[PDB]
């Protein structure tokens, strides 16, 4: 009951606000054949990959879902417009995630997780032993953004 | 010596050990398959299907 089309609707709101005409399509498939690692791709009309998240959903001892993020990118110079926040909102909702872990603490990952903390996607973000970023999901804020009236969501998209 | 790790389950319910760090600290203990013995035990203890190392 979380379809790819939901993110496409949000991205149509996004494209509308920023007066971009390119219809953004959402792709979620194994990153390669037979893999448990998934790739969320945002594609334009030319099928060019404009943004992505490569990740594996896993469960901890307590049965909590964690998204292990190998890589995330906003490729189209689409940047500074909260695109990656929208993608994470959808992923956290789709997989009912309790946390997101980033495997490599790159400058971009630190930047993106900090930004998403300010948007309220995460309660806490911390670089832990092994140099992995652990980001805990702010469930009340996720629920607020997913409200069917889309008031909070529109505010997030339009600043 | 040490191994810092979290046991996790994938979508298929398979156990994976997510290794954050491993070390053979004592120089006298190196080149003697110590870390192999530790991994043998860990894989047996947690009935692991795979081991993932976070930093290459």
């Amino acid at each position: 009951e979380v379809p790819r089309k939901l993110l496409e609707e949000w991205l149509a709101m996004w494209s509308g606000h920023y007066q971009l005409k390119d219809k953004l399509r959402v792709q979620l498939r194994p990153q390669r054949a037979g893999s448990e690692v998934l790739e969320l791709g945002i594609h334009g009309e030319s099928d060019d990959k404009l943004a992505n998240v490569i990740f594996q959903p896993i469960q901890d001892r307590r049965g909590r879902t964690i998204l292990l993020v190998r890589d995330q990118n906003t490729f189209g110079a689409l940047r500074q417009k909260r695109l990656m926040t929208l993608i994470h909102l959808w992923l956290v909702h789709r997989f009912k995630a309790q946390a997101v872990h980033y495997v490599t603490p790159t400058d971009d990952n630190l930047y993106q997780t900090s930004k998403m903390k300010s948007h309220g996607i995460f309660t806490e973000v911390n670089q832990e032993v092994g140099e992995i970023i652990v980001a805990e999901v702010n469930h009340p804020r996720i629920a607020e953004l997913l409200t069917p009236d889309r008031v909070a969501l529109r505010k997030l998209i339009t600043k | 010596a040490n191994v810092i790790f979290q046991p996790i389950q994938d979508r298929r319910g398979r156990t994976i050990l997510l290794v954050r760090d491993q070390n053979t600290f004592g120089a006298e203990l190196r080149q003697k398959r110590l870390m192999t013995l530790i991994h043998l035990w860990l894989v047996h203890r947690f009935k692991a299907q795979a081991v993932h190392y976070v930093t290459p």
Binding site: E1, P3, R4 | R11
Partner: protein, 57 residues
């Protein structure tokens, strides 16, 4: 429950492991054990619990 998951996969444009009608035919003559095992092969493992729905008796 499994049919709902397979229909969703189809609507999402994911590759079909079996057609809806094929699953229904299989489920109709399958034990719970066999149905769960087959669903697991198709990557459909929906939450389902008949114990929760039992009467007070």
């Amino acid at each position: 429950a499994v049919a709902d998951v397979l229909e969703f996969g189809q609507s999402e444009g994911e590759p079909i492991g079996m057609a809806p009608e094929e699953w229904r035919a299989f489920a109709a003559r399958a034990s719970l054990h066999a149905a769960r095992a087959k669903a697991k092969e198709l990557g459909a493992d929906p939450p389902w619990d008949c114990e929760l729905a039992k009467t007070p008796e």
